[PDB]
Amino acid sequence: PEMVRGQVFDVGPRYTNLSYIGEGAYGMVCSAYDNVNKVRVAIKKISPTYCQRTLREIKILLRFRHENIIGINDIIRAPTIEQMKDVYIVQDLMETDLYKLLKTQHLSNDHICYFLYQILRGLKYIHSANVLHRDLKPSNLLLNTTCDLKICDFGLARVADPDHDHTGFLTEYVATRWYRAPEIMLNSKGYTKSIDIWSVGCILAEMLSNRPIFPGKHYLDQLNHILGILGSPSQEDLNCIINLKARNYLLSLPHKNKVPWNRLFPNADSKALDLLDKMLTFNPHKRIEVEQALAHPYLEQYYDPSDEPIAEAPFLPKEKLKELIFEETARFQP
Ligand SMILES: *CCC(=O)Nc1nc2c(s1)COCC2
Ligand SMILES: *CCC(=O)Nc1nc2c(s1)COCC2
Numbered sequence: 486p487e488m489v490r491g492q493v494f495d496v497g498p499r500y501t502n503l504s505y506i507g508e509g510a511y512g513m514v515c516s517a518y519d520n521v522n523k524v525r526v527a528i529k530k531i532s533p534t535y536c537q538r539t540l541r542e543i544k545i546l547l548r549f550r551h552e553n554i555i556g557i558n559d560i561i562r563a564p565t566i567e568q569m570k571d572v573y574i575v576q577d578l579m580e581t582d583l584y585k586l587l588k589t590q591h592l593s594n595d596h597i598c599y600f601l602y603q604i605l606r607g608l609k610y611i612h613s614a615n616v617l618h619r620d621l622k623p624s625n626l627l628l629n630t631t632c633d634l635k636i637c638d639f640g641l642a643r644v645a646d647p648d649h650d651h652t653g654f655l656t657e658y659v660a661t662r663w664y665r666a667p668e669i670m671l672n673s674k675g676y677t678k679s680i681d682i683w684s685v686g687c688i689l690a691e692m693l694s695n696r697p698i699f700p701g702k703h704y705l706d707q708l709n710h711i712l713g714i715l716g717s718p719s720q721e722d723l724n725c726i727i728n729l730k731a732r733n734y735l736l737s738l739p740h741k742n743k744v745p746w747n748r749l750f751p752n753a754d755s756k757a758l759d760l761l762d763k764m765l766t767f768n769p770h771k772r773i774e775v776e777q778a779l780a781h782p783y784l785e786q787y788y789d790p791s792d793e794p795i796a797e798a799p800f801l802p803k804e805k806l807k808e809l810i811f812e813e814t815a816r817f818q819p
Contacts, residue, residue: 489515496528496561496573503528510638511539516578526558527579531572534803535810538640539572543813545616545639548800553607555627555637560814569811579635583688584624587695594754596632597692601760602779602787603634604685609775611636612678613795615645619675620660621684623691644800646676654730655704662707663687663697668769670708671731679769682778686764693750693757715767716743722768756783 486495489503492513496503500517507514512530519526531539546557559575583600586592592600604626611618618625620641627635641660652674658665660675666683669675690698698714701707712718717740726732746758753761760781763773773781779788801809 489513492530493571494528494530495571496575499559500526500528500561500575510640519575525578527576528561529574529576531574533570533807535806536640537806540806540810540813541642542639543574543810545642545800547813547816549610549614549796551607551610551794552633553603553635554610555635560817562811562814564818566808566811569807572810572814577629577635579627580630581628582624583626583628583634583692584622586628587623587691591695592692594757597689597757598754598783598786599632600626600628600634600692601685601689601757602784604636604688605775605779605784606793607634607636608681608685609779609793610796611642612645612681612775615799617643617645617676617678618681618684619643620664621681621688622661622664623688626688643676645678650674650676651728654728654734658704662704663700665707666769667708667711667767670705671735672726672728673769677769678774679772682764682772682775683769685778686761689757689761689764690750693753693761698749711767712738712741714744714749715765716741718767722771725768725770754783756781759783 486493487503488494490505494503494513494515496517499520501520502518503515505515506527509529512532514527514529516525517528543557546555550556555576557574557576561573561575563569608618618636618639620638625636625638627637650673652672654671656674658669658675664684664687666673666680673680687698699707699710701710717738718735723732723735726735746762750758760778760783764778766772779793
C-alpha cells in the first residue's frame, strides 16, 4: 500500500501517482491518476467511531446529481465491516476554491456574475430537495480551470423544517460565524431556506471587495457587524421578533444608520447591489428566495429556468453509524 508524507494513503491499484494537496475538514487529500478514466482525480481520506457528518454527506452527495454540486465518483473501503477502517472518497479534481481565489485574485464583474449564477443554480437544486446546506462560504465553492463552480461540504446540511425554526436568544450555532444570518443570534435554529440566501449574500459582498463583509470575532459581535451596515431594524421587523430577550436586546442598542451599498462597494455593478440588498435583508420573511434571485436583472444573461434543474423528489450508536456507512458505500464494490 502506497505512502504519502509519513501517512498511509491506500487507494488500491486503480489510483496511482499520488500528490499531496492538503488537509480538508476530514483528513488528508491527494490527487491521483485514475488508471480507468485516464484523468487526475482528487481523493479524500476519512479516518475514524466515525462522524455523523461523514454519513450525512455521503447520503446527500450520492442522492444528488447536479452540475453545480460536487459528486462522488468512487468510494474505496475494505470489503467487510470488521476490516473497514479508513474510507476514501474519489471526486473530480478541482483547480481551486473561492476562499483561495479571493485571497489573491480580483474578480471581473463577469466572473462575479457567473459565479453567483452557478451558486444560485446549485442552491435551487438543493432547496428543491427540501435540503439546507447551512455552511455556504467561499471555501465550500470549488472551481475548475474554466471557472465551472461546484458546491461542497454537506456536513452541516439538514432537511428544512420551518415549523420548528424558533428558539431562544443566544442559542449556540455550529455553522461558520461570518456567514450566519442575523436571526441565528436572535430566534432561529437555521431550519429555513432563508438561512442559505443570507450566506450567498455574504459571498456576493466578499466577491465584490475580496474581504468578508461581516467578520465578527465572536457570537454577538457578528450581529453588531450586520447592524453596523444594515442599520437598526425597523419597528415592523423588530415586532416580528416575538421573543422578549431577543427583542429587548435589539431595543437596547443605540440607533445605527444604514451604510449605503454603493459607498461600501463603489466599483460594483448597480444591479449586483440591488440583488445584494435583497439577499442581505434583516427580516428572513422579506429575504429574496433562490428562484427570485435567479430571475433578478443582474443574472439576465444566464437565467434560464428550463436549464436550472430541480430534484426528482424531496430528501444512533457508533456501531449503527459504522454499519450505515458500510451500507451506503456498498455500490462502489465490484
Ligand atoms: C468542500 C471543500 C472541499 O472539498 N474542497 C476541495 N478542494 C479541492 C478539492 S475538494 C479537490 O480538487 C482540489 C481542490
Ligand atoms: C412579522 C413577520 C413577517 O415579517 N412576515 C412576513 N410575511 C411575509 C412577508 S414579511 C413578505 O412576503 C410575504 C409574506
